[PDB]
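In the previous chapter we treated chains in isolation. Here, by contrast, the input contains four separate entities that must be folded as one system, with a combined length of 953 residues.
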Amino acid sequence: EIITLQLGQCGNQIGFEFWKQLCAEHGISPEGIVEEFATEGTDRKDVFFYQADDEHYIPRAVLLDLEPRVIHSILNSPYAKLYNPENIYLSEHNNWASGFSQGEKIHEDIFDIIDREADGSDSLEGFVLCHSIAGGTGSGLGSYLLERLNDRYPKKLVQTYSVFPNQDEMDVVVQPYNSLLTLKRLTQNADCVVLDNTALNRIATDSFSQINQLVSTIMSASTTTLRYPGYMNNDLIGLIASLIFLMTGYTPLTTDQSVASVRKTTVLDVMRRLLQPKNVMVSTNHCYIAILNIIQGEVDPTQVHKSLQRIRERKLANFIPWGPIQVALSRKSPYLPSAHRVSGLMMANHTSISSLFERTCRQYDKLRKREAFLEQFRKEDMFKDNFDEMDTSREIVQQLIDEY
Amino acid sequence: EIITLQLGQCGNQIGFEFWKQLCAEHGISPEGIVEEFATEGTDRKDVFFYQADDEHYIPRAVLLDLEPRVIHSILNSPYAKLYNPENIYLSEHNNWASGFSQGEKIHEDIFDIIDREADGSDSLEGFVLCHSIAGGTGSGLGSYLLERLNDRYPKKLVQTYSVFPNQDEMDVVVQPYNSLLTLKRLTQNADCVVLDNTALNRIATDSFSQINQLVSTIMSASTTTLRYPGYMNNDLIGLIASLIFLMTGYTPLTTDQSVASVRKTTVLDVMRRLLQPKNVMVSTNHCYIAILNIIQGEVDPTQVHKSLQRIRERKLANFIPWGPIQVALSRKSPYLPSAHRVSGLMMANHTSISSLFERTCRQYDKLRKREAFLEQFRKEDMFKDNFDEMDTSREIVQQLIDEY
Amino acid sequence: LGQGDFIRHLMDLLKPELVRPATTLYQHNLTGILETAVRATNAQFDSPEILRRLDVRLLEDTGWDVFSLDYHVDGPIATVFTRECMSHYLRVFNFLWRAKRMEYILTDIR
Amino acid sequence: FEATINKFDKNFSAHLLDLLARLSIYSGMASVISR
C-alpha cells in the first residue's frame, strides 16, 4: 500500500490526472463503481485504492492547498464524487517562508488525516509526494510535511515527483529561494523523480492537461509492476535498492492521432530509444549511475539478452569507473487498447543532473549578493531574525554537487 | 538489407516512383497492406521493406529536401500513408556551398534518423543514394552525407544513381561548380550508376513521370536478383566485385501501347541489343572494362552459351589489352504481366564515360578564368576565405581522367 | 546448395567460428547457429517435417574442413537412399562447399 | 568493522571469479555470463 501527498496547484492537478489514469487502467468507474466486464478482475487494487462497504473504491489520496479554486474545480468534475471529502483539506482563507509557517500552524489536522489513512492499511510501504518546488504553496508545505513525516515515521519510504521551474523561460520571480530550500529538505529527508517544464514541453512539442497527462503516464508506468504482481520486483523497496536523484523517459509518448504509424516495435528498438538524451524528459565526462527499463507487452527474454549484448558492445552508454543495468518486465492492463506491440519506460540516475543545481545555485548566488525580494521573508518568524537557514541550505547543496 | 537516401526534387521523385515500382512488384498495397493473392508469397521483402506489427510494410527510406513543396505533394498521393513520417525530414525554412553549410548545420537529426533505421536491420549490406548533381540541394547535401557517412560507417557499401545535367540543352547556370564538387566527393568516398537527362530523354523519344519511371525500372531490374534469391549473385557485393563508374541499358523499354508488336524475343537478340550505344541510356580507341547482363524470364544456358560464342566471334565489342563479361539470370515477379518472353538489363564500365568529365571540366575551365557567379559562394563559410576546394576538386577529376 | 538464399546467411554466421582450429569446436554450439539461419532466410516457410531431419555433422585441421550437413533419413524413405546416396551426397557436398567459400573470399577481396 | 569489510571483498570476489570461470567451459549454460 501507499499514500499520495499532493500540494499546490501543480500537485493537485498531477493527482487529478494520475487518478484518472489509474481508474482508466483498473476499470474503476468515475463514481467509484466497478464495471461489469471488470467484475472478475485479477489486478491488485489495494495498492492505490481501498474498497468501501458500498462496493465503491476510494483513493488513498489527500488534497492540500493554500487556495480553494483548484480543488473546487476538481469537485465540479465528473470524478468529484470519487475522492474522500474527509481527507480533502482547504485553507479557510507565493512564498516558501509563509508556506512553512502555515505548515507549523496546521500540523494537527493534516497529521490527523494522515494517521487515519495510515491505520487503514496493513502493509503500507512508503509515501508518494507530488508538488512543484517553485511556487510558495508546494515548496514550503512539502518541506514542512517531509520534515515532520521523516520525524514521525522513521520506517516508511518517501518518493516524490518534484517539478522544477523552467529556466530558458525566465515563472516564480522568487523561485531560487524556494527551489534551494526544497532541495535542502529533499536531500536531508527524501528517500528518493526530478521533473522540469522546459524539457517536458520540449518533448510534448517535438495545456497543462496534456503535460500532466504525460507525467501521470510516467507515474503509472513506474508503479505498474507493483500494481500488477509478477515474479521479480514485487515491491517499491526492490525498485529503490536497484538504483540508489533520478530522471525518466517513456518511448510510446504518442498522441491519440499519431497511431497511424504502427511501427514494428521490438524490445531492442525501445530499450535503445530510452537511452537518448532527447527522450530524457528533463533538460566533466558525466556518466550514469544506474539504469532501469520496465517493458510492457509481449517480451522474449532472448530478445532482451540480445539487445543488452548489442548495446553493451556498441558502448552507447558510459558508466562509473569505480563500480560495476536492469531490465524488468511487466504485463499491460487487460483493458486499455494495446496500440503498442511493446512499450518501454526508463528511470535512471546520471551524474549530469548535477548541472540543474549548479544553475539554481548560480541563480541564487546571483540574488543573495544584492538582497532581492527578502522583504516578505523577513515577515515570517523563521526568517524574522536572520537567514542562516539559507546559508546552510546553500552549503548543503554545494556539498551534494561536490559529492556528485 | 539496404537504405535509400534521396535528396533534392530529383531524388525525392526518383524515390517516389522507385517505391511505386517496388510495391507493384511485391504485391504491396498502397497503404502498406498485403493483397490476399500475395499472402503466401515467396519473394523476399526484408531487402527494401520491414514489416510492422499492424502487418503493414514500411520502406527503409528517408526523405531529405531543402524545400517542402515536393514532399508535401508526395504526402497528398495515394501512396502517402505508406512512408514513415518519423524518417521524413523537411527544412523548416540553388548552390552547392549553401547545401554543404546546411548539411553541417543539420548533422544531428539526419544521423539520428539514419542510426534508427540502421539498428533495425541485422545484415545491412550497403547504402543507396538517389540525387541530381547540378541543383543546389542534391549536390551539396549528397556531398555532406557521403563524407560523414564514409567517416561514420567504414564497412558499408555506398551506391548512387547520380543524375547528370543536360549539356546539349544549355538547367543550372552554376552547374559546372556543383557537378565538379559532387564528382570530387564521389571519387573520394563513393563505392560505386551515372545518369543523364539528355540521352535518357533521347531514348524516351525515339513528363518527369515517364523519365523517372524508366529510371526506377532500371533500379528495380538492377536489384531484382538480390530481391529474388537464386543460386549465384546473391548479394550486392557480388555485383560490385564482378565489375570494379557505370552506365546502363534496358531492352524492353516499351510503352504500354507498344505491346502490339509481340516480337519473338530470344536471349541472343536481347543480349545483343544491350551492347549498342543507342541503348546505353547515357550520352582514343575507347573500349570496355566490364559488362554484366541480368536476364529475366525463361532462359536456357545453352542459348546463353551460344549467344556468348557468336558475339565473341563477331567481335562486336572491344576490351582492354591488359586484362582478361558476365551473364546472370533471375526470375520475374509472379505478379506483373510477362508481356516480354525474355528481358535483359545491362550494366557496364566503359572508358568512354571519361568524355563526360572532359566536358564538365571544359565547362568549369570555361568559367574559372573569368570568375562567374562566385558572389554567392563567397557568402558561405566554406568558400569564405578562398576556393582551394575548387582547385583540389578539379585536379582530382583531372587525375581520374588521366587514370582512365 | 540449391537454395542459395539460405547458404548465403549460413556462411556469414559460421565465419567467426570455423576460423578457430577444430579442437575447440563442439557440435552443440553450431546447431544454434544453423537454427538461426533457417529462421532468418526464406527457408522458414517450409514443411516442418523435412526441417526436423536437417542437422549438422562433424567429419573426422580447421573449422572449414570438418563442417558439413547430414539430413539423416530413416524409415520407409530410407529404401531409396540406402546409406549409399548419403555416402555420395557428402562426397559431393565438399566440392560445393569449397567452390562456395572460394567465391565469398573473392567477393570479399573485391 | 572498517578492516573486515575489505576482507569480505577479497573473499567474495574470489568465489565469483570461480563461478564465472566454470560457467564459461560449456558447449542455456553460456548465456548466463551475459546475465
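The radius of gyration of chain B is 21 Å. Chain B touches chain A at residues 50-54, 56, 58, 81, 84-86, 112, 116, 119-120 (CB under 8 Å). Compare these points with the single-chain example from earlier in the chapter.
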